[PDB]
Amino acid sequence: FIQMSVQRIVEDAPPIDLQAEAQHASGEVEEPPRYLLKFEQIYLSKPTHWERDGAPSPMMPNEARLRNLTYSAPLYVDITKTVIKEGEEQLQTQHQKTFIGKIPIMLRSTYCLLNGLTDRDLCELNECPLDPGGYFIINGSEKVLIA
Amino acid sequence: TPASESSGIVPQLQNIVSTVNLGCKLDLKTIALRARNAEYNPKRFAAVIMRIREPRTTALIFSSGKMVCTGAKSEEQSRLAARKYARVVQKLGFPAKFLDFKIQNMVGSCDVKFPIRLEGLVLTHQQFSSYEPELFPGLIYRMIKPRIVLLIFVSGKVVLTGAKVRAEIYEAFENIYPILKGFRK
């Protein structure tokens, strides 16, 4: 879902274009201005949290429990801005790489970087090796989806 | 006993702003046309801007007949220019007058010749003193005694304005200099 499905929706129909009003009679207006928006790959940061100083830090799921924070990661996207503009300057393109959100991640996910760590690593993290997770942590509370 | 423990670095007045009514309505277009050293553009402002090299002043001629004199180093010079301005306008063919002349603003400046700790100053007189290094390098002191505003800079330079009386600059400065000396770095 993270790997493709959200992306398929991003693959689906995000491109939109908009054309300004003609505002008829603005002499030799020529024709009304026009703007188009384009999107590419969607990006995801590892689970992290921004401390009141505005600075980022790693989101330890153990930390998520203690500070009662919601286990989540930043979601990022390739964005493009695109316009013939219905003027002489057609095909002029402008690139963006934009923060779109913080996605709550399932424990033991591929993005749950602890998934590679040994039990010994996990105990080094004070994590339980027989605690596979598979459920989100929301506001420090454990949450499981029922089928 | 002196009035202050520090006293002087006489604060010199640098600018005066005055206004006067010519007592009649005028046609600035005609004025602009006639004048040899004035500017006008209704698309920019409704008044004629006239200048004279005399004391390098500038006048603002409203269609209402009101005028503003600027650039003058003294109230008299402002009065002199404004009077000098009023005459010429009359000399254009208009019933100009010198009705209701008054001073609108005076500007002074001086240097205390020593640096001061603004941090302490903005702290101790936050009620009146005001400063923000992210905003403007000069500290703004709004005195109410004689309702004067001061501008205080890290180099020790000071500017005073909003005055309609020259003594108030001297007075506002007489009150603030000792305090500043007490804030020497």
């Binding site: - | 209704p42 698309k43 920019r44």
Partner: protein, 88 residues
């Protein structure tokens, strides 16, 4: 993270355009606007006030003074303050 531009860019872009010209224009001895009125009303009997404002370069209140002077107005069955030249 995205740079803070101390002032809104588009607003700033707006500023270069804004400084070029103002809508605060002059209006002495009404005449050029009525002549233009004959030109517009020759195409249709009645027009919307905003559209009347578009041909003009003067305040609507002043414009209101003109449209009252040679015409009246309607709702035209569309509420809109639509103006037309006096049939009489």
């Amino acid at each position: 993270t995205n740079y803070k531009p101390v002032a809104n860019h588009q607003y700033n872009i707006e500023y270069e355009r804004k400084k070029k010209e103002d809508g605060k224009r002059a209006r002495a001895d009404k005449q050029h606007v009525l002549d233009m009125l004959f030109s517009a009303f020759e195409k249709h009997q009645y027009y919307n006030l905003k559209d009347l404002v578009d041909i003009t370069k003067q305040p609507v209140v002043y414009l209101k003074e003109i449209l009252k002077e040679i015409g009246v107005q309607n709702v035209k069955g569309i509420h809109k303050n639509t103006w037309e030249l006096k049939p009489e």
